[PDB]
Design an enzyme around this catalytic site. Structure first.
Site, PDB file in Angstrom:
ATOM      1  N   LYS C 323      -5.195  -2.484  -2.246  1.00 39.40           N
ATOM      2  CA  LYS C 323      -3.794  -2.588  -1.855  1.00 39.40           C
ATOM      3  C   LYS C 323      -3.095  -1.239  -1.785  1.00 39.40           C
ATOM      4  O   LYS C 323      -2.295  -1.011  -0.868  1.00 39.40           O
ATOM      5  CB  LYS C 323      -3.041  -3.490  -2.838  1.00 39.40           C
ATOM      6  CG  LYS C 323      -3.653  -4.873  -3.001  1.00 39.40           C
ATOM      7  CD  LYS C 323      -3.045  -5.637  -4.168  1.00 39.40           C
ATOM      8  CE  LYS C 323      -3.560  -5.138  -5.509  1.00 39.40           C
ATOM      9  NZ  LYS C 323      -4.940  -5.619  -5.786  1.00 39.40           N
ATOM     10  N   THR C 324      -3.388  -0.343  -2.726  1.00 43.32           N
ATOM     11  CA  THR C 324      -2.763   0.970  -2.745  1.00 43.32           C
ATOM     12  C   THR C 324      -3.069   1.778  -1.493  1.00 43.32           C
ATOM     13  O   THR C 324      -2.227   2.573  -1.065  1.00 43.32           O
ATOM     14  CB  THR C 324      -3.222   1.744  -3.982  1.00 43.32           C
ATOM     15  OG1 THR C 324      -2.774   1.069  -5.163  1.00 43.32           O
ATOM     16  CG2 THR C 324      -2.668   3.159  -3.970  1.00 43.32           C
ATOM     17  N   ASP C 377       3.613   1.585  -6.716  1.00 42.42           N
ATOM     18  CA  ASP C 377       2.354   0.895  -6.930  1.00 42.42           C
ATOM     19  C   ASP C 377       2.117   0.682  -8.418  1.00 42.42           C
ATOM     20  O   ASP C 377       2.593   1.451  -9.257  1.00 42.42           O
ATOM     21  CB  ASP C 377       1.187   1.680  -6.327  1.00 42.42           C
ATOM     22  CG  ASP C 377       0.905   2.960  -7.077  1.00 42.42           C
ATOM     23  OD1 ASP C 377       1.864   3.711  -7.348  1.00 42.42           O
ATOM     24  OD2 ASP C 377      -0.274   3.218  -7.397  1.00 42.42           O
ATOM     25  N   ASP C 378       1.367  -0.374  -8.734  1.00 33.87           N
ATOM     26  CA  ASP C 378       1.043  -0.735 -10.111  1.00 33.87           C
ATOM     27  C   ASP C 378       2.324  -0.970 -10.918  1.00 33.87           C
ATOM     28  O   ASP C 378       2.642  -0.265 -11.876  1.00 33.87           O
ATOM     29  CB  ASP C 378       0.162   0.340 -10.759  1.00 33.87           C
ATOM     30  CG  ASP C 378      -1.305  -0.038 -10.771  1.00 33.87           C
ATOM     31  OD1 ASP C 378      -1.615  -1.228 -10.991  1.00 33.87           O
ATOM     32  OD2 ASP C 378      -2.151   0.856 -10.561  1.00 33.87           O
ATOM     33  N   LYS C 405      18.560  -3.651  -5.039  1.00 35.10           N
ATOM     34  CA  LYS C 405      19.628  -4.240  -4.238  1.00 35.10           C
ATOM     35  C   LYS C 405      20.836  -3.317  -4.121  1.00 35.10           C
ATOM     36  O   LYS C 405      21.962  -3.799  -3.965  1.00 35.10           O
ATOM     37  CB  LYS C 405      20.054  -5.591  -4.819  1.00 35.10           C
ATOM     38  CG  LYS C 405      20.824  -5.497  -6.124  1.00 35.10           C
ATOM     39  CD  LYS C 405      21.040  -6.872  -6.734  1.00 35.10           C
ATOM     40  CE  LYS C 405      22.286  -6.907  -7.604  1.00 35.10           C
ATOM     41  NZ  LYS C 405      22.681  -8.298  -7.952  1.00 35.10           N
ATOM     42  N   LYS C 482     -13.840  -2.411  -3.183  1.00 38.75           N
ATOM     43  CA  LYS C 482     -14.069  -1.331  -4.138  1.00 38.75           C
ATOM     44  C   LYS C 482     -15.272  -1.634  -5.023  1.00 38.75           C
ATOM     45  O   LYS C 482     -16.148  -0.778  -5.227  1.00 38.75           O
ATOM     46  CB  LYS C 482     -12.801  -1.134  -4.969  1.00 38.75           C
ATOM     47  CG  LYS C 482     -12.760   0.090  -5.859  1.00 38.75           C
ATOM     48  CD  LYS C 482     -11.435   0.116  -6.612  1.00 38.75           C
ATOM     49  CE  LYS C 482     -11.312   1.300  -7.551  1.00 38.75           C
ATOM     50  NZ  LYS C 482     -10.195   1.109  -8.520  1.00 38.75           N
TER      51      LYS C 482
HETATM   52  N1  LIG Z   1      32.666 -16.604   3.904  1.00 37.14           N
HETATM   53  C1  LIG Z   1      31.952 -15.639   3.317  1.00 37.14           C
HETATM   54  N2  LIG Z   1      31.895 -15.611   1.968  1.00 37.14           N
HETATM   55  C2  LIG Z   1      31.183 -14.650   1.376  1.00 37.14           C
HETATM   56  N3  LIG Z   1      30.483 -13.660   1.936  1.00 37.14           N
HETATM   57  C3  LIG Z   1      30.558 -13.711   3.268  1.00 37.14           C
HETATM   58  C4  LIG Z   1      31.252 -14.642   4.024  1.00 37.14           C
HETATM   59  N4  LIG Z   1      31.104 -14.385   5.377  1.00 37.14           N
HETATM   60  C5  LIG Z   1      30.338 -13.323   5.407  1.00 37.14           C
HETATM   61  N5  LIG Z   1      29.970 -12.861   4.171  1.00 37.14           N
HETATM   62  C6  LIG Z   1      29.127 -11.709   3.882  1.00 37.14           C
HETATM   63  O1  LIG Z   1      28.085 -12.163   3.047  1.00 37.14           O
HETATM   64  C7  LIG Z   1      27.737 -11.144   2.081  1.00 37.14           C
HETATM   65  C8  LIG Z   1      28.053 -11.709   0.723  1.00 37.14           C
HETATM   66  O2  LIG Z   1      27.038 -11.273  -0.206  1.00 37.14           O
HETATM   67  P1  LIG Z   1      27.386 -10.956  -1.712  1.00 37.14           P
HETATM   68  O3  LIG Z   1      27.080  -9.553  -2.054  1.00 37.14           O
HETATM   69  O4  LIG Z   1      28.828 -11.379  -1.968  1.00 37.14           O
HETATM   70  O5  LIG Z   1      26.467 -11.960  -2.519  1.00 37.14           O
HETATM   71  P2  LIG Z   1      26.397 -12.526  -4.003  1.00 37.14           P
HETATM   72  O6  LIG Z   1      26.941 -13.951  -3.972  1.00 37.14           O
HETATM   73  O7  LIG Z   1      27.034 -11.614  -4.968  1.00 37.14           O
HETATM   74  O8  LIG Z   1      24.839 -12.625  -4.246  1.00 37.14           O
HETATM   75  P3  LIG Z   1      23.722 -12.042  -5.218  1.00 37.14           P
HETATM   76  O9  LIG Z   1      23.893 -12.584  -6.594  1.00 37.14           O
HETATM   77  O10 LIG Z   1      22.399 -12.435  -4.564  1.00 37.14           O
HETATM   78  O11 LIG Z   1      23.891 -10.528  -5.129  1.00 37.14           O
HETATM   79  C9  LIG Z   1      28.661  -9.974   2.407  1.00 37.14           C
HETATM   80  O12 LIG Z   1      28.028  -9.269   3.466  1.00 37.14           O
HETATM   81  C10 LIG Z   1      29.858 -10.676   3.037  1.00 37.14           C
HETATM   82  O13 LIG Z   1      30.393  -9.767   3.986  1.00 37.14           O
HETATM   83  N1  LIG Z   2     -10.408  -1.939   4.853  1.00 38.65           N
HETATM   84  C1  LIG Z   2     -10.136  -1.375   3.671  1.00 38.65           C
HETATM   85  N2  LIG Z   2      -9.039  -1.786   2.999  1.00 38.65           N
HETATM   86  C2  LIG Z   2      -8.762  -1.228   1.819  1.00 38.65           C
HETATM   87  N3  LIG Z   2      -9.432  -0.275   1.165  1.00 38.65           N
HETATM   88  C3  LIG Z   2     -10.510   0.112   1.852  1.00 38.65           C
HETATM   89  C4  LIG Z   2     -10.926  -0.370   3.083  1.00 38.65           C
HETATM   90  N4  LIG Z   2     -12.089   0.265   3.491  1.00 38.65           N
HETATM   91  C5  LIG Z   2     -12.342   1.103   2.517  1.00 38.65           C
HETATM   92  N5  LIG Z   2     -11.432   1.065   1.493  1.00 38.65           N
HETATM   93  C6  LIG Z   2     -11.447   1.873   0.281  1.00 38.65           C
HETATM   94  O1  LIG Z   2     -11.406   0.982  -0.810  1.00 38.65           O
HETATM   95  C7  LIG Z   2     -10.723   1.606  -1.922  1.00 38.65           C
HETATM   96  C8  LIG Z   2      -9.567   0.711  -2.285  1.00 38.65           C
HETATM   97  O2  LIG Z   2      -9.253   0.920  -3.677  1.00 38.65           O
HETATM   98  P1  LIG Z   2      -7.765   0.860  -4.203  1.00 38.65           P
HETATM   99  O3  LIG Z   2      -7.571   1.786  -5.337  1.00 38.65           O
HETATM  100  O4  LIG Z   2      -6.815   1.069  -3.028  1.00 38.65           O
HETATM  101  O5  LIG Z   2      -7.609  -0.646  -4.664  1.00 38.65           O
HETATM  102  P2  LIG Z   2      -6.605  -1.480  -5.575  1.00 38.65           P
HETATM  103  O6  LIG Z   2      -6.695  -2.938  -5.133  1.00 38.65           O
HETATM  104  O7  LIG Z   2      -5.256  -0.885  -5.584  1.00 38.65           O
HETATM  105  O8  LIG Z   2      -7.298  -1.373  -6.993  1.00 38.65           O
HETATM  106  P3  LIG Z   2      -7.002  -1.715  -8.520  1.00 38.65           P
HETATM  107  O9  LIG Z   2      -6.674  -3.158  -8.678  1.00 38.65           O
HETATM  108  O10 LIG Z   2      -8.269  -1.288  -9.260  1.00 38.65           O
HETATM  109  O11 LIG Z   2      -5.857  -0.779  -8.905  1.00 38.65           O
HETATM  110  C9  LIG Z   2     -10.218   2.942  -1.375  1.00 38.65           C
HETATM  111  O12 LIG Z   2     -11.279   3.865  -1.579  1.00 38.65           O
HETATM  112  C10 LIG Z   2     -10.173   2.688   0.129  1.00 38.65           C
HETATM  113  O13 LIG Z   2     -10.474   3.930   0.747  1.00 38.65           O
END
Ligand SMILES: Nc1ncnc2c1ncn2[C@@H]1O[C@H](COP(=O)(O)OP(=O)(O)OP(=O)(O)O)[C@@H](O)[C@H]1O
Ligand SMILES: Nc1ncnc2c1ncn2[C@@H]1O[C@H](COP(=O)(O)OP(=O)(O)OP(=O)(O)O)[C@@H](O)[C@H]1O
Ligand SMILES: Nc1ncnc2c1ncn2[C@@H]1O[C@H](COP(=O)(O)OP(=O)(O)O)[C@@H](O)[C@H]1O
Lengths: 16, 526, 514
Positions: C323-324, C377-378, C405, C482
């Protein structure tokens, strides 16, 4: 904070 | 007191003459016949920038005293042993020598301490728990009033934290007079504009279109320093308008010079230059409301009307100077936008927002200090509104355990009950997303009222929201309507926006299908 | 004669000289003040001095006074402070005689930190402070100082009315360095003592973060490498004297000297980006293509959306799935100005506070560009987690949840990619709801994919591949790439006869099902 400890001193002599 | 260059504090001087300087002007014969010693010092405390040093520099000049020795508290401290005490002791030699030489026919000496609270604090009684700077306090106490008496000295201390000062320094023998310099009212703000515009009026650069009386109203929680800055910025704006206009039009400089007197310079500075430290900001509402408010249903109106009623109650009540309300709902409902909108529509002079975005990495004690600072600032105005965002994020809550911080919880519980000084009114709005946890913690009975923020729960509401956003066309609209006419939807607005964006990234043909698939993958009931 | 600082010059003109135009009469009634303190800081270069001379040129100013280093210091008592008052004698005379209608005075301080920062130094600082701002106030004096270590300057000198303008100056760059190189190389070029194989542009590009004494130092070194071929010491100090008829400087004589002889003083831009990709990427199935396509779709959204400036993704998979590397590949293909990788390798033994500071600094740097991409990562290692208890660090978890966020300043875009291998834990901790979307990275399932991977690797020939296909093709497998590489390397050690049997033996122990 603990205040800095005491220090020695060095002296320089002058000739008239 | 307005004829020395200081306007807005006439009672705070009228008292300073009775209780301190009545005996320095009465004929000496009767004063001696009474046998009364003079006051030895005074203390001044208030918000910064309100004219404490200016008044101090004038009190001395009014009594024909010698030039004042001004000292700044934080600078005296030193790391070697016996240096701070020497610095403190050095400010009394000229007064001792003059007295020893001239007996009772000496002059008067003035000492002005700034930020005195930084070098004088309550001395630790416990053995082994003594303060770092107790020797400085002892030296100052011994010097001010000791075995050998001085009768030709006056001490003026200035501070902003009068509750941290050692008590032995405030007894009737030392610094026994205390006054408060608060924020100016409208009259004080008119007087300080007159005083700072006298010069321009004299030199005939103040136009007739400029009305200071009107400008007084537009500055609600302004201090003296900020008014001076406003005037200076207005002058600079006038000069810029002069230079730019002249370099673009071939008209005589002198005619332009007469034109720099305009009022437009003043209004332009009141918006882009000066940012009061006790006023309402306009740069935060944009940050916390990034997409406006669209009216997709009835609940929005209900919430806003309830907020208006609460604002009116807090403004027009005498038995309940403090009011609280919690806004609670499911995630992504939009509880931080509605709380900001209510605060904006309140129309109070002082509006501030406390959020965890600006406390990343802070320890709990630092967070407590920050919240205390905000509330202390809020207490200085006559109408205040405060907003506490998240709440579960300020407490560091995590389901495992559970774990959290008790210090912040106790600080909030205590702060939600303390009332401001007499005659001042405050409003508090909190926003959470997990009300069951708060109920468990027994915080939910500290608030006075609760408001629920619902989610979208019908197909027609979704269609109306889409129409107001205006993203899909008639044919796609009909397709969606026929496919989701069943009123079994459960979605939040903030998630709906993200879904629409994600959908719009595909090719023109394969867009409705992706949107419908994403909606289906989402939940469909609580 | 400097590029890239046009806005800086505009700011300089706006701040101080924009208010100088009006005649004294209008400013008098205004009472407006004027700037008299400017501070410049930046690594060594000719720009700062050239700028100082430019300000000297533009205004109708006296011949500027410049002090070169700590010349004020003297052995005797009172002489160190005596040099200061001589500086302002002309200014005082002009102010007292011509009053307001007096010429401007410009003072240039070079290496001011040397004099400003014990009886000599403190007295000198006090004298300078009093002269600059004392009982008598001067309105026709300007002082300019240049430094490379701004943090070593006295705080009192920065108080308003003492040093007003703060300026950061960039370093010299490639083309100027090339001009300096040409000027030095002209002597050898004129006399045909330089080989034609040498390219000055290549060396100018190669030498980075080097000053003039170092830039002479590299050339001199090259010269030496030539002369030593003619010397015949180590037995006497007698030399060839027949090879002395001719002598030139080859390209290598330079290159060696920049590696093994002369080292830069300011370090160098070190990068080991390959560290995260040590075996490339080999397409052994469709999932790799699907993952890359999803990454490209996410990238385009960040770059074109007006309502969503921030986007987050999560990479999921079992251990040893690679994945890394698949995250770094996407980051590279993003083609953004700013790219950074946060890894726990660089933080060993740190406490929670240190980790929080380290993450905060990287994100702060990210915020200042226009569009940025960051990969973490990790996650489970970042906020150390142990199944027993369980135990972990709450401070880092809360910092991450807050950071995931927080939108950047208005008009800027950010992308975040996180990698982990324990989805259930994150879901329990309530963090999986912060991310916008997820992707899955699977293992090798069927024997056909394994055979394709072996063919791409090219470690076994047809004869062994036939037996391997016979054994494996009729069965399902569960192995990560790996681990596959590790097993191949481990089995290759023994003799050619036992390799296939050893490999197939190990595969059975490492075999399993989901
Ligand atoms: N009627 C509305 N009421 C509230 N927000 C609105 C409305 N219409 C549009 N929006 C937009 O929606 C977004 C509201 O997101 P907000 O940050 O208030 O979320 P939150 O309820 O605090 O959520 P969280 O806990 O996930 O952060 C803002 O972009 C606001 O401009
Ligand atoms: N198609 C491929 N996709 C991913 N890695 C590949 C591929 N072909 C070869 N590799 C090689 O495989 C190795 C991937 O190991 P890597 O450290 O990225 O894995 P990881 O899932 O993050 O490991 P771990 O869980 O041990 O931390 C790297 O040497 C990468 O070069
Ligand atoms: N009441 C006032 N009238 C006129 N000017 C004022 C007043 N209050 C403050 N100012 C202006 O603000 C400046 C700075 O305030 P200052 O005297 O330093 O007060 P503080 O000690 O509270 O900071 C003053 O020198 C003056 O120009």
């Amino acid at each position: 904070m603990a205040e800095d400890a005491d220090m020695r001193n060095e002296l320089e002599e002058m000739q008239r | 007191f307005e004829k020395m260059g200081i306007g807005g504090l006439d009672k705070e001087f009228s008292d300073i003459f009775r209780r301190a300087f009545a005996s320095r002007v009465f004929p000496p014969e009767i004063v001696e016949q009474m046998g009364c010693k003079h006051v030895k010092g005074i203390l001044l405390y208030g918000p910064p920038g309100c004219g404490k040093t200016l008044l101090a520099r004038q009190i001395g000049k009014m009594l024909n005293a010698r030039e004042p020795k001004v000292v700044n508290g934080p600078e005296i401290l030193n790391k070697y042993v016996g240096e701070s005490e020497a610095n403190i002791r050095k400010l009394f030699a000229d007064a001792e020598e003059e007295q020893r030489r001239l007996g009772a026919n000496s002059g008067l000496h003035i000492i002005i301490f700034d930020e005195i609270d930084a070098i004088c604090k309550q001395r630790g009684s416990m053995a082994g728990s003594t303060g770092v700077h107790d020797t400085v306090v002892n030296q100052l106490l011994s010097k001010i009033d000791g075995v050998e008496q001085l009768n030709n000295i006056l001490v003026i201390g200035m501070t902003n934290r009068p509750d941290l000062i050692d008590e032995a320094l405030l007894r009737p023998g030392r610094l026994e007079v205390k006054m408060e310099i608060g924020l100016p009212d409208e009259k004080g703000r008119l007087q300080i504009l007159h005083i700072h515009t006298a010069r321009m009026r004299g030199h005939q650069l103040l136009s007739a279109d400029v009305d200071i009386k009107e400008l007084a109203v537009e500055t609600k929680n302004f201090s003296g320093a900020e008014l001076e800055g406003l005037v200076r910025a207005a002058q600079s704006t006038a000069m810029n308008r002069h230079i730019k206009a002249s370099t673009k039009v071939e008209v005589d400089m002198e005619k332009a010079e007469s034109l720099q007197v305009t009022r437009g310079d003043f209004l332009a500075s009141l918006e882009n230059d000066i940012k009061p430290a006790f006023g309402t900001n306009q740069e935060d509402y944009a940050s916390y409301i990034m997409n406006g408010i669209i009216k997709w249903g009835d609940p929005v109106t209900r919430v806003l009307d309830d907020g208006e009623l609460l604002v009116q109650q807090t403004k027009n009540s005498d038995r309940t100077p403090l009011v609280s309300v919690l806004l609670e709902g499911p995630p992504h409902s939009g509880k931080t936008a509605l709380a900001a909108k209510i605060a904006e529509e309140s129309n109070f002079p002082f509006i501030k927002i406390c959020s965890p975005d600006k406390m990343i990495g802070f320890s709990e004690t630092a967070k407590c200090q920050a919240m205390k600072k905000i509330f202390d600032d809020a207490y200085k105005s006559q109408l205040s509104c405060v907003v506490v965002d998240d709440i579960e994020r300020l407490l560091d809550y995590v389901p495992i355990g559970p774990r959290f911080s008790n210090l912040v919880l106790q600080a909030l519980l205590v702060l939600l009950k303390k009332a401001p000084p007499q005659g001042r009114k405050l409003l508090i709005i909190g926003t959470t997303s997990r009300k069951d946890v708060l109920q468990e913690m027994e915080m939910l009975n500290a608030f006075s009222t609760t408001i629920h923020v619902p989610n979208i729960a019908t197909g027609e509401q979704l269609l109306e929201a889409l129409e107001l956003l205006g993203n899909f066309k008639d044919k796609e609209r009909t397709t969606i309507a026929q496919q989701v006419k069943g009123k079994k939807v459960w979605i939040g607005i903030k998630k709906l926006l993200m879904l629409i964006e994600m959908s719009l990234q595909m090719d023109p043909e394969y867009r409705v299908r992706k949107f419908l698939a994403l909606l289906r993958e989402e939940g469909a009931s609580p």
